[PDB]
Enzyme design. Structure first.
Site, PDB file in Angstrom:
ATOM      1  N   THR A 153       0.816  -1.211   0.000  1.00 53.04           N
ATOM      2  CA  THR A 153       0.000   0.000   0.000  1.00 53.04           C
ATOM      3  C   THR A 153       0.853   1.265   0.000  1.00 53.04           C
ATOM      4  OG1 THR A 153      -1.884  -1.091   1.056  1.00 53.04           O
ATOM      5  CG2 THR A 153      -1.711   1.302   1.277  1.00 53.04           C
TER       6      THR A 153
ATOM      7  N   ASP B 182      27.079   2.194 -15.816  1.00 50.25           N
ATOM      8  CA  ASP B 182      28.315   2.187 -15.044  1.00 50.25           C
ATOM      9  C   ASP B 182      29.373   3.072 -15.688  1.00 50.25           C
ATOM     10  OD1 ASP B 182      27.467   0.601 -12.993  1.00 50.25           O
ATOM     11  OD2 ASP B 182      28.639  -1.168 -13.559  1.00 50.25           O
TER      12      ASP B 182
ATOM     13  N   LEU C 257      21.466   2.272 -13.458  1.00 48.89           N
ATOM     14  CA  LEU C 257      22.083   3.303 -14.274  1.00 48.89           C
ATOM     15  C   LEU C 257      23.378   2.791 -14.887  1.00 48.89           C
ATOM     16  CD1 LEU C 257      21.622   6.393 -11.913  1.00 48.89           C
ATOM     17  CD2 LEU C 257      20.111   5.648 -13.767  1.00 48.89           C
TER      18      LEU C 257
ATOM     19  N   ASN D 230      22.143   0.137  -9.453  1.00 51.70           N
ATOM     20  CA  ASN D 230      21.352   1.355  -9.324  1.00 51.70           C
ATOM     21  C   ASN D 230      20.492   1.627 -10.552  1.00 51.70           C
ATOM     22  OD1 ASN D 230      23.194   2.250 -11.220  1.00 51.70           O
ATOM     23  ND2 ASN D 230      23.986   3.951  -9.987  1.00 51.70           N
TER      24      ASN D 230
ATOM     25  N   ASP E  26      -9.696  -2.670   0.009  1.00 50.74           N
ATOM     26  CA  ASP E  26      -8.570  -3.504   0.420  1.00 50.74           C
ATOM     27  C   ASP E  26      -8.871  -4.263   1.706  1.00 50.74           C
ATOM     28  OD1 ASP E  26      -5.461  -4.095   0.234  1.00 50.74           O
ATOM     29  OD2 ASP E  26      -5.860  -3.453   2.294  1.00 50.74           O
TER      30      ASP E  26
ATOM     31  N   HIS F 236      -1.723  -9.169  -1.245  1.00 52.55           N
ATOM     32  CA  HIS F 236      -1.036  -8.570  -2.379  1.00 52.55           C
ATOM     33  C   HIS F 236       0.418  -8.333  -1.996  1.00 52.55           C
ATOM     34  CE1 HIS F 236      -1.254  -4.737  -0.234  1.00 52.55           C
ATOM     35  NE2 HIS F 236      -2.518  -5.038   0.005  1.00 52.55           N
TER      36      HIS F 236
ATOM     37  N   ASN G 178      26.850  -1.601  -9.367  1.00 48.78           N
ATOM     38  CA  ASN G 178      26.311  -1.074  -8.121  1.00 48.78           C
ATOM     39  C   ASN G 178      24.791  -1.158  -8.065  1.00 48.78           C
ATOM     40  OD1 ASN G 178      25.566   1.026  -9.864  1.00 48.78           O
ATOM     41  ND2 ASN G 178      27.279   2.328  -9.227  1.00 48.78           N
TER      42      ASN G 178
ATOM     43  N   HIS H  19      -8.960  -8.485   1.717  1.00 43.24           N
ATOM     44  CA  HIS H  19      -8.111  -9.357   2.519  1.00 43.24           C
ATOM     45  C   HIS H  19      -8.940 -10.405   3.247  1.00 43.24           C
ATOM     46  CE1 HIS H  19      -4.104  -7.725   2.030  1.00 43.24           C
ATOM     47  NE2 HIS H  19      -4.578  -6.499   2.150  1.00 43.24           N
TER      48      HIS H  19
ATOM     49  N   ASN I 213       5.789  -2.022   3.297  1.00 40.01           N
ATOM     50  CA  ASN I 213       4.971  -1.653   4.447  1.00 40.01           C
ATOM     51  C   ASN I 213       5.705  -1.926   5.752  1.00 40.01           C
ATOM     52  OD1 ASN I 213       2.839  -0.627   3.025  1.00 40.01           O
ATOM     53  ND2 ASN I 213       1.444  -2.344   3.405  1.00 40.01           N
TER      54      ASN I 213
HETATM   55  C1  LIG Z   1      14.918   7.644 -10.620  1.00 41.27           C
HETATM   56  O1  LIG Z   1      14.967   9.032 -10.383  1.00 41.27           O
HETATM   57  C2  LIG Z   1      15.816   9.401  -9.288  1.00 41.27           C
HETATM   58  C3  LIG Z   1      15.681  10.899  -9.137  1.00 41.27           C
HETATM   59  O2  LIG Z   1      15.835  11.559 -10.386  1.00 41.27           O
HETATM   60  C4  LIG Z   1      17.255   8.950  -9.546  1.00 41.27           C
HETATM   61  O3  LIG Z   1      17.980   9.110  -8.331  1.00 41.27           O
HETATM   62  C5  LIG Z   1      19.019  10.104  -8.392  1.00 41.27           C
HETATM   63  O4  LIG Z   1      20.242   9.551  -8.836  1.00 41.27           O
HETATM   64  C6  LIG Z   1      21.305  10.508  -8.931  1.00 41.27           C
HETATM   65  C7  LIG Z   1      22.490   9.782  -9.524  1.00 41.27           C
HETATM   66  O5  LIG Z   1      22.306   9.537 -10.911  1.00 41.27           O
HETATM   67  C8  LIG Z   1      21.601  11.105  -7.558  1.00 41.27           C
HETATM   68  O6  LIG Z   1      22.549  12.153  -7.737  1.00 41.27           O
HETATM   69  C9  LIG Z   1      23.559  12.143  -6.705  1.00 41.27           C
HETATM   70  O7  LIG Z   1      23.212  13.040  -5.661  1.00 41.27           O
HETATM   71  C10 LIG Z   1      24.150  13.066  -4.570  1.00 41.27           C
HETATM   72  C11 LIG Z   1      23.570  13.960  -3.495  1.00 41.27           C
HETATM   73  O8  LIG Z   1      22.164  13.747  -3.485  1.00 41.27           O
HETATM   74  C12 LIG Z   1      21.572  14.532  -2.429  1.00 41.27           C
HETATM   75  O9  LIG Z   1      20.789  15.584  -2.974  1.00 41.27           O
HETATM   76  C13 LIG Z   1      19.643  15.179  -3.755  1.00 41.27           C
HETATM   77  C14 LIG Z   1      18.974  16.441  -4.262  1.00 41.27           C
HETATM   78  O10 LIG Z   1      18.336  17.074  -3.155  1.00 41.27           O
HETATM   79  C15 LIG Z   1      18.707  14.332  -2.883  1.00 41.27           C
HETATM   80  O11 LIG Z   1      17.611  13.883  -3.670  1.00 41.27           O
HETATM   81  C16 LIG Z   1      19.464  13.127  -2.307  1.00 41.27           C
HETATM   82  O12 LIG Z   1      18.594  12.375  -1.474  1.00 41.27           O
HETATM   83  C17 LIG Z   1      19.165  11.080  -1.219  1.00 41.27           C
HETATM   84  O13 LIG Z   1      19.360  10.898   0.166  1.00 41.27           O
HETATM   85  C18 LIG Z   1      18.157  10.969   0.984  1.00 41.27           C
HETATM   86  C19 LIG Z   1      18.572  10.710   2.417  1.00 41.27           C
HETATM   87  O14 LIG Z   1      19.251   9.458   2.455  1.00 41.27           O
HETATM   88  C20 LIG Z   1      17.112   9.953   0.479  1.00 41.27           C
HETATM   89  O15 LIG Z   1      15.893  10.134   1.188  1.00 41.27           O
HETATM   90  C21 LIG Z   1      16.880  10.147  -1.027  1.00 41.27           C
HETATM   91  O16 LIG Z   1      15.906   9.225  -1.506  1.00 41.27           O
HETATM   92  C22 LIG Z   1      18.196  10.036  -1.780  1.00 41.27           C
HETATM   93  O17 LIG Z   1      18.673   8.721  -1.517  1.00 41.27           O
HETATM   94  C23 LIG Z   1      19.593   8.356  -2.564  1.00 41.27           C
HETATM   95  O18 LIG Z   1      20.713   7.627  -2.057  1.00 41.27           O
HETATM   96  C24 LIG Z   1      20.426   6.329  -1.465  1.00 41.27           C
HETATM   97  C25 LIG Z   1      21.752   5.702  -1.112  1.00 41.27           C
HETATM   98  O19 LIG Z   1      22.348   5.224  -2.321  1.00 41.27           O
HETATM   99  C26 LIG Z   1      19.620   5.449  -2.440  1.00 41.27           C
HETATM  100  O20 LIG Z   1      19.222   4.257  -1.773  1.00 41.27           O
HETATM  101  C27 LIG Z   1      18.388   6.202  -2.942  1.00 41.27           C
HETATM  102  O21 LIG Z   1      17.664   5.392  -3.848  1.00 41.27           O
HETATM  103  C28 LIG Z   1      18.792   7.524  -3.574  1.00 41.27           C
HETATM  104  O22 LIG Z   1      19.595   7.181  -4.693  1.00 41.27           O
HETATM  105  C29 LIG Z   1      20.720  13.570  -1.555  1.00 41.27           C
HETATM  106  O23 LIG Z   1      20.251  14.221  -0.376  1.00 41.27           O
HETATM  107  C30 LIG Z   1      25.518  13.547  -5.096  1.00 41.27           C
HETATM  108  O24 LIG Z   1      26.472  13.520  -4.043  1.00 41.27           O
HETATM  109  C31 LIG Z   1      25.984  12.644  -6.252  1.00 41.27           C
HETATM  110  O25 LIG Z   1      27.226  13.114  -6.777  1.00 41.27           O
HETATM  111  C32 LIG Z   1      24.914  12.542  -7.339  1.00 41.27           C
HETATM  112  O26 LIG Z   1      24.827  13.827  -7.936  1.00 41.27           O
HETATM  113  C33 LIG Z   1      20.333  11.668  -6.927  1.00 41.27           C
HETATM  114  O27 LIG Z   1      20.580  12.007  -5.567  1.00 41.27           O
HETATM  115  C34 LIG Z   1      19.188  10.656  -6.977  1.00 41.27           C
HETATM  116  N1  LIG Z   1      17.953  11.264  -6.508  1.00 41.27           N
HETATM  117  C35 LIG Z   1      17.010  10.595  -5.836  1.00 41.27           C
HETATM  118  C36 LIG Z   1      15.803  11.387  -5.432  1.00 41.27           C
HETATM  119  O28 LIG Z   1      17.124   9.403  -5.568  1.00 41.27           O
HETATM  120  C37 LIG Z   1      17.315   7.479  -9.947  1.00 41.27           C
HETATM  121  O29 LIG Z   1      18.622   7.156 -10.408  1.00 41.27           O
HETATM  122  C38 LIG Z   1      16.295   7.153 -11.037  1.00 41.27           C
HETATM  123  N2  LIG Z   1      16.277   5.724 -11.307  1.00 41.27           N
HETATM  124  C39 LIG Z   1      16.453   5.205 -12.527  1.00 41.27           C
HETATM  125  C40 LIG Z   1      16.407   3.708 -12.616  1.00 41.27           C
HETATM  126  O30 LIG Z   1      16.640   5.909 -13.513  1.00 41.27           O
HETATM  127 ZN   LIG Z   2       6.505  -5.469   2.899  1.00 41.36          ZN
HETATM  128 ZN   LIG Z   3      25.288   1.465 -12.245  1.00 42.07          ZN
HETATM  129 ZN   LIG Z   4      -3.844  -4.370   1.756  1.00 39.05          ZN
END
Ligand SMILES: *[C@@H]1O[C@H](CO)[C@@H](O[C@@H]2O[C@H](CO)[C@@H](O[C@@H]3O[C@H](CO[C@H]4O[C@H](CO)[C@@H](O)[C@H](O[C@H]5O[C@H](CO)[C@@H](O)[C@H](O)[C@@H]5O[C@H]5O[C@H](CO)[C@@H](O)[C@H](O)[C@@H]5O)[C@@H]4O)[C@@H](O)[C@H](O)[C@@H]3O)[C@H](O)[C@H]2NC(C)=O)[C@H](O)[C@H]1NC(C)=O
Ligand SMILES: [Zn+2]
Ligand SMILES: [Zn+2]
Ligand SMILES: [Zn+2]
Ligand SMILES: C[C@@H](c1ccc2ccc(O[C@H]3CC[C@@H](C(F)(F)F)CC3)c(C(F)(F)F)c2c1)N1[C@@H]2CC[C@H]1C[C@@H](C(=O)O)C2
Ligand SMILES: *[C@@H]1O[C@H](CO)[C@@H](O[C@@H]2O[C@H](CO)[C@@H](O)[C@H](O)[C@H]2NC(C)=O)[C@H](O)[C@H]1NC(C)=O
Ligand SMILES: [Zn+2]
Ligand SMILES: [Zn+2]
Ligand SMILES: [Zn+2]
Ligand SMILES: [Zn+2]
Length: 776
Positions: free
Chosen positions: A158, A664, A662, A660, A260, A413, A658, A264, A179
């Site tokens: 959810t 490499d 994206l 992600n 929902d 689900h 890694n 269930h 969840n």
């Molecule tokens: C789907 O779309 C998203 C968003 O467009 C993509 O995720 C982005 O990936 C890029 C890399 O290509 C990251 O850029 C890096 O940013 C860091 C610094 O980032 C800080 O600032 C940004 C902007 O405010 C902020 O969003 C970041 O927030 C991270 O940390 C928060 C606290 O932990 C967390 O709540 C948030 O979700 C985000 O977590 C990220 O890191 C963790 C650990 O790996 C990961 O699990 C999570 O999924 C996130 O990736 C952060 O404060 C720089 O230092 C680097 O050099 C680089 O520039 C973006 O930060 C990242 N943005 C988000 C919102 O995730 C995905 O790649 C895309 N997916 C696909 C498949 O295309």
């Molecule tokens: Zn779960």
């Molecule tokens: Zn990668």
């Molecule tokens: Zn449910």
């Protein structure tokens, strides 16, 4: 005290932030900071929510929940049915559809308001019940814009799906990966029940209300305390729409936990599914009747959306880890329609994830779950890149549960989001939406961009493809722009000598590049190489093609790799030896073999096959992977060409070490062929395109295209396929179906842009790149 107690007189469900003073907002109860008269002034229930004949023209009793006096329209608190009962008008459901070509909004409305009506656990198949059970909802579906179903995100739980809708992000990105979840950094656990879920540290990304707020658009208080009934929330949203221009919100949200809860406990096909569905429809009818009362029925944009479906799940279909493992007390498991395993305690030296995976791998002939390291999960799920996602993951088959150790429910689900039972609903109704239009199914990650467009908001970065859903909207304010190419290709000639090579080995555009050259959106040096049967872009950095394009017609003769040519590899005189691979490394690597991107089996002529054995067509491949690849090349491609009147295939490597999702960098690549600079791909992709009108050949298509794609993991064993010991005709196709992918997923993992030179609009192309062939 900390709050105190003032009066809520004239402040009921205020939007202003108020903490020193006592509050009267939607969530004041949730923080126990309401004022003494809040319940008595704001949470009124007297005489129900519907007007009757006896109440028409009544003297205003403030005790009543809603009023049926003449003044109630001016004071803004009639019941939703006041006009139909007391003024002879009609319910909005009884009115015929009339196309809202332009928003008919009252003066002071700069934009059409957006109301998001979300429902929990709404199966798309519920809409088959039709106007029989849900007349109001069916009217929204029939006269508005609707998809047959909307694909949720994995897991189909959810909160991960609700927040994905709010952010346009995958759960690995916005952080709500389930969840139930454990964050090692926080040393805390998130749960459906508890206060930790209200802590904002869990919720990443930028939800819609924050995006609206940061850009000057007023967002109403979306979230309500549980004790406030649904009908009161509906009347409040109507009251907010009657607020003065400087306070009226532009975006509203209503969330319902039904159907929902019933699904269930009763099962998705249970006979008393009808009662919750009618109750949801009655709530919708109250909203539409109220909007008609405020003359906002032809002004507001309404979105009826669900987060996930519901499947028949009972405890009689429960798998137990104790029948596989000997250390169930040494582990912690997130149970249910999905499995996540973790050590119960750190510093346990008797915890080996390798031993747990092996003991869960194909141990029963009908084993109803499959263990996975998260990096080996199908890339379409996008479930690896988060510290809250455990390394060990169990994909549970539909209708089944997994527990640790041995019903009150018949439905659940959480399964793979491609499962038909997990699909949910989308309906768009309003001036900006199209009239009586059916749109193809799409994924819920795309809705954030559309909702931003419907409010004139600039979307925060998200995983939707902006413009892929422009066909839903009568008026589109976003024009997609093709990305610009970063690296241009060298077109090298015959510049080297076959004697100059220390290989260690022994021994067109009109036809094979049908949709234009893929654009390299990153800085590298690559060579475009032409051949009779295939064209490729060869990377000088990664020593292999980035992409390889070829067309196979419906009329094609399959051939075999000749026995004398079996181990043939030839130098490419257009590429330097320093930018070429060598066969000595493959001989010196005990576990890695080599394959070919363009299959030598599909060569047009014996002379053309010599090109298929060029070193520039060689990629690293495990013998285990080569079994999958060779069956795909020798058997499946011609079969697809026969069914689809020819196919164009684009194949190449993918490096994501890694996990992600994206592309490499060279530094992020962590495995190479022994004693070499040749990188080992983590995955291999292919894009299979043909004419949607299959009466036309693939190379001579005039209109819309049809695409299928996959991203196969490149693994040293076939343990993922429990039936791999049998012939490839028994397991290879099943593995490929599980790893189906959108072209957009490939674009993220390769930095390439496809379908750049074609004959349809970029919007149509963007929809094609988001398509997922489910085989379901
Ligand atoms: C789907 O779309 C998203 C968003 O467009 C993509 O995720 C982005 O990936 C890029 C890399 O290509 C990251 O850029 C890096 O940013 C860091 C610094 O980032 C800080 O600032 C940004 C902007 O405010 C902020 O969003 C970041 O927030 C991270 O940390 C928060 C606290 O932990 C967390 O709540 C948030 O979700 C985000 O977590 C990220 O890191 C963790 C650990 O790996 C990961 O699990 C999570 O999924 C996130 O990736 C952060 O404060 C720089 O230092 C680097 O050099 C680089 O520039 C973006 O930060 C990242 N943005 C988000 C919102 O995730 C995905 O790649 C895309 N997916 C696909 C498949 O295309
Ligand atoms: Zn779960
Ligand atoms: Zn990668
Ligand atoms: Zn449910
Ligand atoms: C627990 C969580 C929450 C509760 C109910 C929820 C009911 C519905 C819903 O989502 C629907 C689909 C999306 C749309 C739109 F956002 F697109 F409009 C909105 C309705 C969400 C979600 F996940 F999105 F936020 C809920 C989120 N609240 C925590 C943290 C966010 C919240 C705020 C709250 C606080 O402190 O105030 C503290
Ligand atoms: C994984 O399975 C193996 C094989 O069954 C387990 O190894 C056995 O452990 C049992 C303990 O009950 C002992 O009898 C032996 O030491 C092992 N062999 C046999 C034939 O039983 C191993 O313990 C399992 N590991 C986990 C983590 O479940
Ligand atoms: Zn947990
Ligand atoms: Zn709520
Ligand atoms: Zn309801
Ligand atoms: Zn198309």
């Amino acid at each position: 005290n900390t709050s105190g107690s003032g009066s809520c007189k004239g402040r009921c469900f205020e939007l202003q932030e108020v903490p020193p003073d006592c509050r009267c907002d939607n969530l004041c109860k949730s923080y126990s900071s309401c004022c003494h008269d809040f319940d008595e002034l704001c949470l009124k229930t007297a005489r129900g929510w519907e007007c009757t004949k006896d109440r028409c023209g009544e003297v205003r009793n403030e005790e009543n929940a809603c009023h049926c006096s003449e003044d109630c329209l001016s004071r803004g608190d009639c019941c939703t049915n006041y006009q139909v009962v007391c003024k002879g008008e009609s319910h909005w459901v009884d009115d015929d559809c009339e196309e809202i070509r332009v928003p008919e909004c009252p003066a002071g409305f700069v934009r059409p308001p957006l109301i998001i009506f979300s429902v929990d656990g709404f199966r798309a198949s519920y809409m088959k019940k039709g106007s029989k059970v849900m007349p109001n909802i069916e009217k929204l579906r029939s006269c508005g814009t609707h998809a047959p179903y909307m694909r949720p995100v994995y897991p189909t739980k959810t909160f991960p799906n609700l927040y994905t809708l709010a952010t346009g992000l995958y759960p690995e990105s916005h952080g709500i990966v389930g969840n139930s979840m454990y964050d090692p950094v926080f040393d805390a656990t998130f749960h459906l029940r508890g206060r930790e879920k209200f802590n904002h540290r869990w919720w990443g990304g930028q939800p819609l209300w924050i995006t609206a707020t940061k850009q000057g658009v007023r967002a109403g208080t979306f979230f309500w305390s549980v004790s406030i009934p649904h009908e009161r929330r509906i009347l409040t949203i109507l009251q907010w729409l009657s607020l003065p221009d400087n306070e009226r919100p532009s975006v509203y949200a209503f969330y319902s936990e039904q159907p929902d809860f019933s699904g269930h406990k009763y099962g998705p096909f249970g006979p008393e599914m009808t009662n919750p569905l009618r109750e949801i429809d009655k709530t919708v009818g109250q909203l539409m009747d109220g909007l008609k009362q405020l003359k906002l029925h032809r002004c507001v944009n309404v979105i009826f959306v669900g987060d996930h479906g519901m499947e028949d799940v009972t405890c009689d279909r429960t798998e137990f880890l104790s029948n596989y493992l000997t250390n169930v007390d040494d582990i912690t498991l997130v149970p249910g329609t999905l499995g996540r395993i973790r050590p119960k305690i750190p510093n346990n030296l008797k915890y080996d994830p390798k031993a747990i995976i092996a003991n869960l791998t194909c141990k029963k002939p009908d084993q109803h779950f499959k263990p996975y390291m998260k990096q080996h999960l199908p890339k379409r799920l996008h479930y690896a890149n988060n510290r809250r996602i455990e390394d060990l993951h169990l994909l549970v088959e539909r209708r089944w549960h997994v527990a640790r150790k041995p019903c009150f429910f018949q439905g659940d689900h959480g399964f793979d989001n491609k499962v038909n039972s997990m699909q949910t609903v989308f309906v768009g109704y309003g001036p900006t939406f199209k009239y009586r239009t059916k749109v193809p199914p799409f994924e819920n990650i795309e809705l954030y961009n559309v909702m931003c467009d419907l409010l004139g908001l600039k979307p925060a970065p998200n995983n939707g493809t902006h413009g892929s859903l422009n066909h839903l909207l009568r008026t589109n304010t976003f024009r997609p722009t093709l990305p610009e190419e970063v690296s241009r290709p060298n077109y090298p000639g015959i510049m080297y000598l076959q004697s100059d090579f220390d290989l260690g080995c022994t021994c067109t555009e009109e036809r094979h590049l049908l949709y234009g050259r893929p654009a390299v959106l990153y800085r590298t040096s690559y060579d475009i190489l032409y051949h009779t049967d295939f064209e490729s872009g060869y990377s000088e950095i990664f020593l292999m093609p980035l992409w390889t394009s070829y067309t196979i017609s419906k009329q094609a003769e399959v051939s075999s790799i000749p026995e004398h040519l079996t181990n043939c590899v030839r130098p490419d005189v257009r590429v330097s030896p320093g930018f070429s691979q060598n066969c000595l490394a493959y001989k010196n690597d005990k576990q890695m073999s080599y394959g070919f991107l363009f299959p030598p089996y599909l060569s047009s002529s014996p002379e053309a096959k010599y090109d298929a054995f060029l070193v520039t067509n060689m990629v690293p491949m495990y013998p285990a992977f080569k079994r999958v690849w060779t069956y795909f090349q020798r058997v499946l491609v011609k079969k697809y060409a026969s069914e689809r009147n020819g196919v164009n295939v684009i194949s190449g490597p993918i490096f994501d070490y890694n996990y992600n999702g994206l592309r490499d960098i060279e530094d992020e690549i962590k495995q190479y062929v022994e004693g070499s600079s040749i990188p080992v791909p983590t995955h291999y992709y292919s894009i299979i395109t043909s004419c949607l009108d299959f009466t036309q050949p693939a190379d001579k298509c005039d209109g819309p295209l049809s695409v299928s794609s996959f991203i196969l993991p490149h693994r040293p064993d076939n343990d993922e396929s429990c039936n791999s010991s049998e012939d490839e005709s028994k397991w290879v196709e099943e593995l490929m179906k599980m790893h189906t992918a959108r072209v957009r997923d490939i674009e993220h993992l390769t930095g390439l842009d496809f379908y750049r030179k074609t004959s349809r609009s970029y919007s149509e192309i963007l929809t094609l790149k988001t398509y997922l062939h489910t085989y379901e």
